Amino acid sequence: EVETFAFQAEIAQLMSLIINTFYSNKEIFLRELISNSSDALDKIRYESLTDPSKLDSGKELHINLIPNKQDRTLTIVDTGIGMTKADLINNLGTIAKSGTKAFMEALQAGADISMIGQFGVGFYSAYLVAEKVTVITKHNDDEQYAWESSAGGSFTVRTDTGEPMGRGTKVILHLKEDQTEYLEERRIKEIVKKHSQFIGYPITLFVEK
Numbered sequence: 001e002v003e004t005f006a007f008q009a010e011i012a013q014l015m016s017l018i019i020n021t022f023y024s025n026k027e028i029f030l031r032e033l034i035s036n037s038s039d040a041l042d043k044i045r046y047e048s049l050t051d052p053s054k055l056d057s058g059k060e061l062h063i064n065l066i067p068n069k070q071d072r073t074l075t076i077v078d079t080g081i082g083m084t085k086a087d088l089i090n091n092l093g094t095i096a097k098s099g100t101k102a103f104m105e106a107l108q109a110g111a112d113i114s115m116i117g118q119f120g121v122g123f124y125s126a127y128l129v130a131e132k133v134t135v136i137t138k139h140n141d142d143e144q145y146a147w148e149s150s151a152g153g154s155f156t157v158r159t160d161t162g163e164p165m166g167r168g169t170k171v172i173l174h175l176k177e178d179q180t181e182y183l184e185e186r187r188i189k190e191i192v193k194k195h196s197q198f199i200g201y202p203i204t205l206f207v208e209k
């Protein structure tokens with residue numbers, strides 16, 4: 001059972017700007033997703049300080065980067081706080097309407113796409129490199145859900161019958177045909193070292209057969 005939703009008009013506009021603007025510095029999508037994962041991990045860590053049972057769903061706080069050249073996917077997995085169904089529908093837990101407004105004012109006032117995370121909508125930088133994004137998530141207070149969008153103005157939400165996650169979020173990037181450099185180990189390592197060197201959680205880059 002799949003529910004299809006329209007993006008708010010401002011988010012659709014943000015997504016088409018990300019997709020259509022000529023902008024060569026695409027590698028910053030990975031910094032933005034890792035930063036989102038770090039923020040999610042901070043949230044469950046804070047809640048566990050006063051309630052250790054919040055970690056019954058998984059004690060380890062970490063980030064995995066999983067390239068798969070056969071599927072042409074790069075998956076960013078974290079064991080952070082996760083998202084409820086309502087979070088997913090409400091722009092993946094962001095204040096994306098007001099953040100898009102601020103971001104687009106900044107852009108015509110000098111800024112470039114790389115500053116997107118200062119406006120709280122860094123998730124959407126995934127569409128620099130991905131034709132489709134699937135987000136699988138599990139919050140302690142809800143069931144496991146899958147969000148998906150190929151842009152074009154709509155997204156879907158369904159209950160996820162896939163492999164149970166425990167707690168956290170998995171962002172599966174279905175890469176564009178010409179963006180497969182972000183499946184190569186040396187390229188991913190370079191980007192993590194350049195932009196994510198002070199993330200306070202282990203980032204494990206999986207290797208392939």
Ligand SMILES: O=c1cc(C(F)(F)F)[nH]n1-c1ccccc1
Binds near residue numbers: 033038039171
């Ligand atoms: O772990 C992740 C990954 C994302 C995403 F990149 F997809 F946006 N958000 N997120 C998060 C952040 C804070 C609270 C709950 C979930």
